[PDB]
Structure 1
Amino acid sequence: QFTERALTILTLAQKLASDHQHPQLQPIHILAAFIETPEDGSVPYLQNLIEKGRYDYDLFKKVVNRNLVRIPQQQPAPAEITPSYALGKVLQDAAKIQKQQKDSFIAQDHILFALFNDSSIQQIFKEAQVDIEAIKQQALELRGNTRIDSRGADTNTPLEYLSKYAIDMTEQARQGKLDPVIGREEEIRSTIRVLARRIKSNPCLIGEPGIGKTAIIEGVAQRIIDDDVPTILQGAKLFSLDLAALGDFEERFKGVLKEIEESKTLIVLFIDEIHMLMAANILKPALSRGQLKVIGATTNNEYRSIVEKDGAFERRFQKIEVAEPSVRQTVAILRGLQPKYEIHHGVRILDSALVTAAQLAKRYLPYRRLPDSALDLVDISCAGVAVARDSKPSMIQNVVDSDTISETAARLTGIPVKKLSESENEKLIHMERDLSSEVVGQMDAIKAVSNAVRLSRSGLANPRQPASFLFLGLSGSGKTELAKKVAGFLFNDEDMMIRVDCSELSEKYAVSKLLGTTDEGGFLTNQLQYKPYSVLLFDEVEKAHPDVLTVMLQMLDDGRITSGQGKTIDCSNCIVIMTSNLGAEFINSQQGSKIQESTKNLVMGAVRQHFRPEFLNRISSIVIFNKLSRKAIHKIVDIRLKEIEERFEQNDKHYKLNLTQEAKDFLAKYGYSDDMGARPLNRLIQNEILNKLALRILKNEIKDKETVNV
C-alpha cells in the first residue's frame, strides 16, 4: 500500500485534480498537490530532494497551477476518475526508487519519485524532475532510511536521532505492547502534575531501582494515549532515551536535542537511572534554552552526585521519591498480570496464591522491590511448574496456593511448613507451647519473655520500638538458645541472633558499631542494615562503657540509630536484648531456691545501680533463669540426641541412637557444671561418647543403622 502521508497527498492530488475538476490525472498535476504553500510544511517546495538535489522550486513555484488551470476543464465524476496510466504508473512507478534507495512501501519521495519523467516543465528549457539525480542524492539528505510504514508523520527525516534510538511507548501503548500500571497514579498525576507544573515540569523520580519508576512512565505514556494528559502536556508524547552510545559518538545524543526541538516540545523525554556528567554535562543546553520538558529520574545515588553540584538544573526538577509499593499494588498488578504471566506461560494460577505470594514475599523479601520479586516468584512459580508441566511429568495447569507460595518461595531460603502454618498470629498463641519445646523449664522465660514480645508482636509493638530484655543465669542455660529460639521461632532464622559484645565492644566501639565516615561504619550496621529482621545479643551489657549506652538507649528508645552515613535504621523488627551475669552471685537465692524477687529486687537494685532509668525502664521483662531441676538438667539430653541424629541418623549415616540415664548420669552428673551448666557436657560428649563410636565406626564390630547405649 502507498504511504498514508504519500496517500494523504495522493488523494489530495486526486482532490487536487478534483477542485478544478480536471479531465485526467496527468504528470504535472500533483506538482500543485505536493504543495499546500511554499512552507516546508510542503517539503516539495524547498525541503524537497530536488531543490536540494537539482531543481529549486522557489520561482519554480510559479508554473504548477498554471498547468492545472490550463488543463481543459471537466465535470465532477470524470475528475479523479482515471489513473491515466501515463500518470497511473506513478502508482507503481513510485516503487522504483524503493529499490535503488532501499525502501518498501511507496512514500512521499516515491510518489514524487515516479513523477520524475513528465511531471515537470519538459521543454528545451526544462524545469523538471531529474530522474535519479535529486532523490537518490537527497533521499539520503532527507532521511537516509526513509521507509517505515504508510503510517507515521512527515517523511522529511528532520531528526535522525529521534527516529533512530528514541523510543515512543505511546506508539507501543496504542500498539498495546506495554502492561498498564497502577497506584503511582498519585505519582503518575503528581509527576505529570510536575510535568503539568509550568515552573518545574521536569520531575526527579527518586528511589532504589526496580520499583516501577518507568512503570510510572508506562501509565504516563498511556495517559498520553489515554488523553488524560493535561492541556499543557497534551501535544507532547513520550520519548524515553535508553542511552546506547556505540570521533565523539555521543553528540548524536546532543544532535537529537534539535530533532525534538524540531518537533518543538511535541514529546517528552524520560531518562531513568543514568543521570551523570555526560559530552561533558548531560542534557541542558536544549533544556537550558528554556525548552524541553523531560521526565527525570534517579536513585538518590545519582541524585547524590552531579545534581548536588548545581541544584539549579534541578531548578527544573521536583524530586519525587517512589516507595516500595503497597500490597494491593503488587496484588492489583498481580491481579492484572496474574492472567498475563500465566497466559504468558500459558498456564493458570490460584489468585488465592497470588495475594498470598506478596504476603510472605513482602515479609521475607531481603532485597528487592516486591512486585518484581513477586512477579519473579510468580513467573518462578509460573514457569517453574509450567516447565514442570511442559516436559512430561503437569496435571495442574492451574497452580495451588501453598507450594506456589512456599515451595517456590522456599527458593529464597526454606522452611516451608513453618512458612505455611503461621498466620502471623499463630506464633504467639502457639509460641509458649513451642517455646516450651526448646528452653527447658523456664516457664518464667516462657511466659515473660514471649508474652512481652507477644506485646511486641500482636501488632502492639510501637511503629518504632522492639521488646526489651535483660536476663540473668547460666550463659549456656539456653539463654542464647532462648533468643536463638526467638530468632528461630520468630524470624525462622538462626542468623537473626547476632553476637554483639557490649563488654569488649564498648567505648570507642561507638565508632566501631558505626562511624560517621572520617564498608560498615561499624559492626552493628550491616548486621541489620542488610536484614532489618534480627535478634540482638548484647554481651554483658553492664560491662560496656557508658559511652555507647546513650546510643544504646537510642537503640532502646525509638528503635533506630543514626548510621555512619547518618541513616537512622529500623531495629523495631527485632527485639532488643540485654545481658547481665551479675545475678550468678544472686543465684545464691536460687541456690536457696528462692522466688528470685527476693534478689530480683536486689537484681533490679543491682541493675538500677549503673544506668539511666530510661536505659533501665526500657526492658520489657527481666527473667532470672531458674535452678536446673534434674528434668531441666536431663532434658538437655535430647538436645544432644538431636544434634547427634542430625548427622548420623540424618544428614550422613542414618545411624540410630539410644542412651540410658545410667550413662546419662554417667554424663549429666559430670556433664553438669555449676557456673557453666552443661555447656561443658556438650564439648565433653565430643569424644568419650562420640568418638567411642568414631572408634566403633571402623571398629565396626557393630555397624551403622544400629544403636547400642552404654
Structure 2
Amino acid sequence: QALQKYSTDLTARAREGKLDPVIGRDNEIRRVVQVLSRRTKNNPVLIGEPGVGKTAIVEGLAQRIVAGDVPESLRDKTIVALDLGSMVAGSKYRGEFEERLKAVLDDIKNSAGQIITFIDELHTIVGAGADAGNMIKPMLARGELRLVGATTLDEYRKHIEKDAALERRFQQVYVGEPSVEDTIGILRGLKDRYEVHHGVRITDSALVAAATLSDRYITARFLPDKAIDLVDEAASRLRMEIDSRPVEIDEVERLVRRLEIEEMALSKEEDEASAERLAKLRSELADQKEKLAELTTRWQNEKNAKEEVGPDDIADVVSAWTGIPAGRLLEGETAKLLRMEDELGKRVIGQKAAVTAVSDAVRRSRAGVSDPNRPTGAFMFLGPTGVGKTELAKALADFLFDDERAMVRIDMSEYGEKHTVARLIGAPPGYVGYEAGGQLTEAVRRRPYTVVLFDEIEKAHPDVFDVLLQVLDEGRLTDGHGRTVDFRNTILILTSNLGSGGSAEQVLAAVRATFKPEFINRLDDVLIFEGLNPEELVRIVDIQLAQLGKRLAQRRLQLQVSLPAKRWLAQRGFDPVYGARPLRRLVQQAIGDQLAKMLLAGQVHDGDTVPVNVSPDADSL
C-alpha cells in the first residue's frame, strides 16, 4: 500500500486506452523481454539520443502485456512507474526518506515478482542523499526488483558511468534512430490520433512530405520527434484558419485597422515637413484597402462554388520555422524571379555575364533542380579595382532579404597568419575562449539562409583556403563544441583582385598559381569582371546624383541638374585604371563642397532647389 503513494500504474493507464500506438521496433522489445526474464541481474536500460523513442518502447511493452503477446514468464505482470521526485517531498528529518524507500523496497520484494518497477530519467537516482539510491544496490544484483530505465546517451556517461559499482547492475540496450521509410510508417499509424484532437483530415501525401522534408532542413534534432511537430502544427494552423478567416486576409485587415489610427492622429500635426509624410502614408492606406476588398471578393468566388492538410501546409511550417523558403512559388514570387537581372541592374551596371550567373543559381534552386546536399552556389568573381564586384554581392543580399546588413561578411585581409583560423572555428576544449564557439559557425547556425561573403580572399594565408576546402562541395564544418553546421542553403561569394589588367590568361594563370586544383575544382564558374566603358559611366552618374538627392531629402532640399553638367561629370570620369571610384570624389569636389559652403553661410535654406550649371570649366550653383 506504500506503492500507491509514490507511483502511478503504467499497466492500468494502458488498459483504459490512454497510450499511443507503438509501431515497429520489434528487436528492441524482444531484447527488453529476454533481458527482463533472466535469473539474476534482470534489468535493462534503454540508451540513445533524445527523441528516437525510448518511453515509446516501454509503453509498447505495456500494451503488449495487456494484450497477451508476451511469454509465460511475463504473462500477467503489472508495471509500476516509480516517481523519485515525490519521495523526497517532505523528508527534512534525519531518516524519513530512507524509511520511505525501505518501505517501498520491502513491499516490492514482498510480492513474488508480479511487479516491474520502471524508473524514467534514472540518472536522477544518484542523488536523493543530502548514502541514498545506494541501498538499492544489494537488491539489484540479485534480481528482486526488475528495473526498466531509459536515459539519454550523454547523461549516462556523466552521472552513471562515474560509478562503475552501480553501472555493473545494468544491461545496456542501444536504440538507434529510424530511417525515412520507417518514420513514414510510424506517422501512418499515428495520424488517426491527431485527426481526432484537431477536427481535420491528414493526407498520406502529406505524411510522406513531413518526413522527407524534415530530413534535409532540420538537422539539429533527431527522427520521429522532428517529423511529428510539422504534422501537429499544420493541423493546428488549419483549425485556426477554419474558425476565423484564412491567412493573408487577416494580416491585410490588421494593418489596415492600424494605418487608419496612424493617419488619423497624424493629420492633426500643425507642421509643414509632416505634410509630405501624411500625403505618402495616405496612399498606402488606399492601396491596402484595395487588395483587401479584392481578397474578400476572390474568397467568395471560392466560397460559393482547403479542408485537409497537404504537402503545402507542411512546407509552409518548415519555412516559417528555420527561415528557409521551401514553398511552391505562389505566382507572386515567380513573377519577381522572372525579372531579376532587371532588379539587380538598378544597382550594378554592366557585368551582364556575371549578373546572369549569380541570378541563375537562384531560379534553378527555387524550382527544385539543384543538388539537395551542396551549397546553393559557390563562385568567385575577380577582376580590376572599382569595377563593382563587392557591390554585386550587396545588391544580391538586398534583393533576397530587403536589408543589406542581414548577410555575413568577413574581411579576409586580417587572416594574415595561419593561427587566425581559430577565430572562425572556435578553440578546442580546455582553452581560454571555449564557451563562445566559433564566430562564422555560430553566425550561420542561427539563420541558415544568409549569404556569406569572403572579401579580398587572396590576401590571406594559404591555410584558410584549406579550411574552406570542405565548406564548398559539402556545406559542413564542425567547431570546437563538436556541433556540425550545415551550409547547404547559403550562397558563397569570394571576391579578389588577382591579375590586375591581364587580358584573360594573365589572370587565369595567376589564379592557377595561387590556388590549388583541389580548391579551384569545388568552385562553380569563375566570373571575370571587365573594365568600364565610357558609355556605362553616364549612368553611374545618374545613380550617384540620385543617391545624393535621397540623402538631401532630410531637409526637403532638392537640386536640378542640367544635361551639360551630367555629361561633363561623366567625361571627367577618367583613368580606366581606377574604375568608378574617382567619380564619387569628383562629385563631392564639384557639387558637395560648394553646396556645404553655401549651406551654412545663409543664402540657402530648406525647401529650396538649387540648379547646377556648367561654367566654362567648373560647376556653379
Q: Structure 2-normalised TM-score?
A: 0.62
One-letter code aligned to 1:535: V
Q: Unpaired runs of 5+ in structure 2?
A: 37-41, 247-253, 255-295, 613-621
Q: Distance in 1 between matches of 2:232 and 2:195?
A: 12
Query: After alignment, is 282-291 or 401-410 more displaced?
Result: 401-410
Contact 1:334 1:354 in 2 (8 A): no
Contact 1:473 1:626 in 2 (8 A): yes
* Residues 1:189 and 2:26 aligned together: yes
CA distances 1:310-354 after superposition (whole Å, capped 9, x unpaired) = 4644851223244697773685367334422323xxxx3674995
Q: Distance in 2 between matches of 1:508 and 1:403?
A: 47
Contact 2:81 2:119 in 1 (8 A): yes
Aligned to 1:543: 459
Pick aligned residue for 1:269 from 99, 102, 118? 118
Aligned to 2:428: 516
Q: Unpaired runs of 5+ in structure 1?
A: 1-156, 590-597
One-letter code aligned to 2:35: R
Identity %: 33
In structure 2, relative to structure 1, the CA distance for the partners of 1:459 and 1:604 (3 Å cut) is same
Q: Distance in 2 between matches of 1:485 and 1:338?
A: 45
CA distances 1:237-289 after superposition (whole Å, capped 9, x unpaired) = 54444553433676556754554445526335151485573235758624444
Query: After alignment, is 397-406 or 622-631 more displaced?
Result: 397-406
Aligned to 1:198: 35
In structure 2, relative to structure 1, the CA distance for the partners of 1:329 and 1:381 (3 Å cut) is farther
Secondary structure (helix, strand or coil) at the match of 1:295 reads strand
CA distances 1:496-521 after superposition (whole Å, capped 9, x unpaired) = 84223332145222222222122333
Secondary structure (helix, strand or coil) at the match of 1:516 reads coil
* Residues 1:297 and 2:136 aligned together: no
* Residues 1:442 and 2:291 aligned together: no
Pick aligned residue for 1:560 from 443, 451, 476? 476
Contact 2:351 2:530 in 1 (8 A): yes
Pick aligned residue for 2:239 from 349, 361, 382? 382
Aligned to 2:197: 341
In structure 2, relative to structure 1, the CA distance for the partners of 1:363 and 1:566 (3 Å cut) is closer
Q: Distance in 2 between matches of 1:582 and 1:608?
A: 11
Secondary structure (helix, strand or coil) at the match of 1:546 reads coil
- More relative contact order, 1 or 2 (CA 8 Å, 6+ apart): 2
Q: Distance in 1 between matches of 2:372 and 2:105?
A: 52
Aligned to 2:522: 618
* Residues 1:500 and 2:410 aligned together: yes
Aligned length: 510
Contact 1:469 1:576 in 2 (8 A): yes
Aligned to 1:319: 174
CA distances 1:385-425 after superposition (whole Å, capped 9, x unpaired) = 64779xxx99999477699668877765879xx7644399x
Secondary structure (helix, strand or coil) at the match of 1:538 reads strand
Equivalent residues in 2 for 1:593-632, closer than 5 Å = 598-599=503-504, 601-628=505-532
Contact 2:206 2:310 in 1 (8 A): yes
Q: Distance in 2 between matches of 1:636 and 1:363?
A: 46
In structure 2, relative to structure 1, the CA distance for the partners of 1:542 and 1:637 (3 Å cut) is same
One-letter code aligned to 2:329: E
Aligned to 1:166: 7
Aligned to 2:283: none
Secondary structure (helix, strand or coil) at the match of 1:204 reads strand
Q: Structure 1-normalised TM-score?
A: 0.55
CA distances 1:674-702 after superposition (whole Å, capped 9, x unpaired) = 757479869x99x97xx99x99xxx8859
In structure 2, relative to structure 1, the CA distance for the partners of 1:333 and 1:616 (3 Å cut) is same
One-letter code aligned to 1:372: D
Equivalent residues in 2 for 1:135-534, closer than 5 Å = 157=1, 159-160=2-3, 163-181=4-22, 185-186=23-24, 188-198=25-35, 202-208=44-50, 213-215=54-56, 217-229=58-70, 234-241=75-82, 243-244=84-85, 245-246=88-89, 247=91, 251=98, 252=100, 256-262=104-110, 264=113, 266-267=115-116, 269-272=118-121, 275=124, 277-279=126-128, 285=137, 286-290=139-143, 291-298=145-152, 300-310=153-163, 312-313=167-168, 315-322=170-177, 328=184, 332=188, 335-343=191-199, 348=200, 351=203, 369-372=226-229, 374-376=231-233, 378-383=235-240, 386=243, 398=307, 412=321, 420-422=327-329, 433-435=339-341, 437-438=343-344, 440=348, 441-449=350-358, 461=371, 463=373, 467-473=377-383, 479=389, 482-483=392-393, 497-506=407-416, 507-514=418-425, 515-517=427-429, 518=431, 519-534=435-450
CA distances 1:633-692 after superposition (whole Å, capped 9, x unpaired) = 74897899899999x9xxx9xx9x99989598799889999757479869x99x97xx99
One-letter code aligned to 2:479: S
In structure 2, relative to structure 1, the CA distance for the partners of 1:325 and 1:304 (3 Å cut) is farther
Equivalent residues in 2 for 1:633-652, closer than 5 Å = 634=539
Deviation at 1:564, TM superposition (A): 0.7
Structure of larger gyration radius: 1
One-letter code aligned to 1:192: I
